[PDB]
């Protein structure tokens, strides 16, 4: 009830290739490792020996195995997975002690979908049923976990990262050795992704004096499964004009700023000409809001697999969007983030493992004030 040690450091994952959990599907129990998803709603998993996977889901071994008798396939812009539908008993080593029968996509055929040198074969939508393929019918993880058992309907994540990644995903509760400070909520607009309403951007502290409805179309939402910080294209334009701006005693390639090229040193990396960035998220009251400040150790990640270069490349994880605002992994590792779904709300603190130096650290602060935040969603 405020510290769940079993569950901290029960997230791994390599940079570039996100964050996973350890997870059993089964009866027997057969262990897989998870990608953790809040932009998603399937609990799907490798079905057969794709050679990139290190193990599979074999329904044949299970004697919990359910058929549903339905499948389903689920397209990406670049690429998919095809899955055989059906339920399984699943629980979580390293979260709550529990069991629970879940909804599961047997993958049985992919493209782009799992990564080459990855070591997860799983992925665990934890966005809400709206999203959920093929219809809304199919039940995610999360809600079948909640209505299940006595696991409290929130979990949080804490994703830290540095070629190895690791974090916290805290089921049922929040753990407040992970953060710094106050935690500040955000209202969930919509309970399909996770849905949240940009209201002010800053650079360096500097407006943008956009119409703020820009920062959210046509949506903005919080997503582990995603790197960069996406933004529409007009806001990215903005952004990258005033990053310019403020970093203008270094020249560089106008294809970094595009994600077209890398960008390499040799630890003697700049960071303090680089900009700090600030969303200010809608509050809890009526014209209140609160700020969270990213540093360029957040916009600015090492390229490991350079094979060509012997310096420390980066990339600028900043990139436009048309599905309107990411809050990913670019966002979220400055943070312990709180998905309050029984309250309908996203709570945002420093996280105690965040990358920082001696200068700059990454912050939530409030309150503010902000009228017409109504204004700002999209509809
Ligand atoms: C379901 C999915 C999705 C997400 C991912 N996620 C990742 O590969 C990934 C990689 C690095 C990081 C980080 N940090 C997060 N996620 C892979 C496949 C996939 F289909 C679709 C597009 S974006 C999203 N939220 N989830």
Same mark, same amino acid.
């Given at each position: 009830r405020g510290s769940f040690v079993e569950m901290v450091d029960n997230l791994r994952g390599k940079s570039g290739q996100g964050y996973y959990v350890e997870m059993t599907v089964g009866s027997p129990p057969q262990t897989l490792n998870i990608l953790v998803d809040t932009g998603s709603s399937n609990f799907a998993v490798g079905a057969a020996p794709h050679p990139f996977l290190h193990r599979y889901y074999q329904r044949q071994l299970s004697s919990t195995y359910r058929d549903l008798r339905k499948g389903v396939y689920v397209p990406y812009t670049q690429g998919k997975w095809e899955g055989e539908l059906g339920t399984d008993l699943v629980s979580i080593p390293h979260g709550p002690n529990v069991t629970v029968r879940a909804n599961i996509a047997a993958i049985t055929e992919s493209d782009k979908f799992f990564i080459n040198g990855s070591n997860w074969e799983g992925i665990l939508g934890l966005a809400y049923a709206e999203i959920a393929r093929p219809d809304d019918s199919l039940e995610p993880f999360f809600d079948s976990l909640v209505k299940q058992t006595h696991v409290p309907n929130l979990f949080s994540l804490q994703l830290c990262g540095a070629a190895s990644v690791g974090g916290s995903m805290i089921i049922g509760g929040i753990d407040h050795s992970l953060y710094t400070g106050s935690?500040?909520?955000?209202?969930?607009?919509?309970?399909?992704?996770?849905?949240?309403?940009?209201?002010?951007?800053?650079?360096?502290?500097?407006?943008?004096?956009?119409?703020?409805?820009?920062?959210?179309?046509?949506?903005?939402?919080?997503?582990?499964?995603?790197?960069?910080?996406?933004?529409?294209?007009?806001?990215?334009?903005?952004?990258?004009?005033?990053?310019?701006?403020?970093?203008?005693?270094?020249?560089?390639?106008?294809?970094?700023?595009?994600?077209?090229?890398?960008?390499?040193?040799?630890?003697? $990396?700049?960071?303090?000409?680089?900009? %700090? *960035?600030?969303?200010?998220?809608?509050?809890?009251?009526?014209?209140?809001?609160? #700020? !969270?400040?990213?540093?360029?150790?957040?916009?600015?990640?090492?390229?490991?697999?350079?094979?060509?270069?012997?310096?420390?490349?980066?990339?600028?994880?900043?990139?436009?969007?048309? $599905?309107?605002?990411?809050?990913?992994? %670019? *966002?979220?590792?400055?943070?312990?983030?709180?998905?309050?779904?029984?309250?309908? #709300? !996203?709570?945002?603190?420093?996280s105690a493992c965040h990358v920082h130096d001696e200068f700059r650290t990454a912050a939530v602060e409030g309150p503010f004030v902000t009228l017409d935040m109504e204004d700002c969603g999209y509809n």
């Open positions: 935690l500040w909520y955000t209202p969930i607009r919509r309970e399909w992704y996770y849905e949240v309403i940009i209201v002010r951007v800053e650079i360096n502290g500097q407006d943008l004096k956009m119409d703020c409805k820009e920062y959210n179309y046509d949506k903005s939402i919080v997503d582990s499964g995603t790197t960069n910080l996406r933004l529409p294209k007009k806001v990215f334009e903005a952004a990258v004009k005033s990053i310019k701006a403020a970093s203008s005693t270094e020249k560089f390639p106008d294809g970094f700023w595009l994600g077209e090229q890398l960008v390499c040193w040799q630890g003697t $990396t700049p960071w303090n000409i680089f900009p %700090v *960035i600030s969303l200010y998220l809608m509050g809890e009251v009526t014209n209140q809001s609160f #700020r !969270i400040t990213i540093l360029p150790q957040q916009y600015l990640r090492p390229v490991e697999d350079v094979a060509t270069s012997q310096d420390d490349c980066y990339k600028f994880a900043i990139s436009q969007s048309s $599905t309107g605002t990411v809050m990913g992994a %670019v *966002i979220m590792e400055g943070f312990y983030v709180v998905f309050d779904r029984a309250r309908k #709300r !996203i709570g945002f603190a420093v």
